[PDB]
Design a binder for this molecule. Sequence first.
Ligand SMILES: CN(C)CCCN1c2ccccc2Sc2ccc(Cl)cc21
Ligand SMILES: CN(C)CCCN1c2ccccc2Sc2ccc(Cl)cc21
Lengths: 156, 156
Amino acid sequence: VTQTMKGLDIQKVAGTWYSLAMAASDISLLDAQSAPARVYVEELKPTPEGDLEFLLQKWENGECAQKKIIAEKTKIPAVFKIDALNENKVLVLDTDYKKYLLFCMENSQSLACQCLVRTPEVDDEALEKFDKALKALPMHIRLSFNPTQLEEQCHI
Amino acid sequence: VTQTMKGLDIQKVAGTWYSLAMAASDISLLDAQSAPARVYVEELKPTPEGDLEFLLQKWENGECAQKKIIAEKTKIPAVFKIDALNENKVLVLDTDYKKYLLFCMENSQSLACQCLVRTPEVDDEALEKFDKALKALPMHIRLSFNPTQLEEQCHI
Ligand SMILES: CN(C)CCCN1c2ccccc2Sc2ccc(Cl)cc21
Ligand SMILES: CN(C)CCCN1c2ccccc2Sc2ccc(Cl)cc21
């Protein structure tokens, strides 16, 4: 991924978000409701020391679970790192802070991204920017959700 | 759907095709490998009387089945009709006859479409046209396949 935001004021991205759209390099990453990249954002929490913490929802066994994950900071302001079996990088491509924010999760050759929004509505404008950002990238599946699904656990 | 091809010479669309990309109004139509719209095109056969016949592949129980379906002709050259529990319309939006062909299956509020190609390669140009044609339409999932998957039963 070759697109980060400059002057990333991480403190300003805290609060409430909606995973409006999702996309992945491989069909099986967003494939079924249980698929590995199919993860729903509830909340972004930065820590005082500048780490970034996710609140998420996942369909796991027979239902919608809750989760926390903490992405530790780096030298480049917009790149974070999560400790799993892999080297998992999170990158903030772009955000205007108060409507939308775009980001990608990547490893290593797998890659997923998302268009986050503040309210339960279809920001047409946000979807463009998200589309522009991806045509640089080798994606093979995309999803987006309606306002009705946006107010449910795990998106219905 | 508000886009058909004019002067549709149905005889010229016979032979071999590859379901390069797919898209649907609802996530669950292309969702899992078993999903209702997830149907792979092997061959288009017109009949002498101008009916249009599909050869397809579907993942059904534990494997990739074969199928035939016959879409009967109408007054408008580019619209066909299949007899199921529903009124199922097929529409040919566009084809240059020798590289790509776009079409949509619709009922009634469900809708899926596809970009068909002649060989196992990514026609970048074909994907544009397909993208143009859909932004008129309320889609919420898209897929595309690589050349490797294109030579397998049911796309791997
Ligand atoms: C335990 N899980 C639910 C979380 C890892 C899922 N997840 C993910 C998915 C597909 C490919 C790469 C990644 S890294 C990542 C980075 C940030 C976030 Cl928010 C999610 C992910
Ligand atoms: C028995 N099945 C495998 C065939 C029906 C599936 N199929 C379909 C899917 C989702 C929504 C509407 C339709 S009508 C249709 C028209 C032409 C073709 Cl080629 C396929 C379909």
